[PDB]
């Protein structure tokens, strides 16, 4: 018997293409709502260390899209983990840890989390946790510090929260 998840989660893959628009580079892969279905998917997809440069993996719930235009993200923000002095498997493990924190609902303010994104770039790789409300400092801070715990980030790895919106 399967073990149910608190939320339905949807995997998105972005493939960088100069032709298509930012939104059109995003591809919806599949949705799941049980622990077992997650492992089925995770075991049969390439890890982040192996995907093309400029590509993203993203995991979001409540059918929320990894896009600015989405209403759930518009007033939102994100904890950004810039990975320096990280191995390919450090990347894969940190990403996996983020996934398990999300589907596991490890955060007290789990309602505030929209999803997580990993960016594969040559200059620098990044893993981000997207929050629903940027102005909810207490929720962000709790998510932030727990994230630093669950991921056991070194001093070299940076953790910074930022608003999605561009504002003065």
């Amino acid at each position: 018997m399967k073990h149910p998840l608190m939320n339905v989660w949807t995997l998105w893959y972005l493939e960088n293409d100069r032709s298509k628009s930012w939104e059109d580079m995003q591809n919806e892969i599949t949705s799941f709502d049980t622990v077992e279905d997650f492992w089925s998917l995770y075991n049969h997809i390439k890890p982040p260390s192996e995907i093309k440069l400029g590509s993203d993996y993203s995991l979001f719930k409540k059918n929320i899209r990894p896009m600015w235009e989405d209403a759930a993200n518009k007033q939102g923000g994100r904890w950004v983990i810039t990975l320096n002095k990280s191995s390919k498997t450090d990347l894969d493990n940190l990403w996996l840890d983020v996934l398990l924190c999300l589907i596991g609902e490890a955060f007290d303010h789990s309602d505030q989390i929209c999803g997580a994104v990993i960016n594969i770039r040559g200059k620098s790789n990044k893993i981000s946790i997207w929050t629903a409300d940027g102005n909810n400092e207490e929720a962000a801070l709790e998510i932030g510090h727990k994230l630093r715990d669950a991921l056991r980030l070194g001093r070299n790895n940076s953790l910074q929260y930022q608003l999605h919106k561009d504002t003065m």
Binding site: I29, E36, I103
Partner: protein, 41 residues
Amino acid sequence: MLERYSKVDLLALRYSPLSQTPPGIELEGRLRRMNIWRTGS
């Protein structure tokens, strides 16, 4: 507490037979089309 799983909990279920089931062919088709399908699977 309800519908909350720790890292250890979730990892334990990784070795469940239901976690071993491969993706459906449609999903597999989508994964190969995106080239994100794991090699040798």
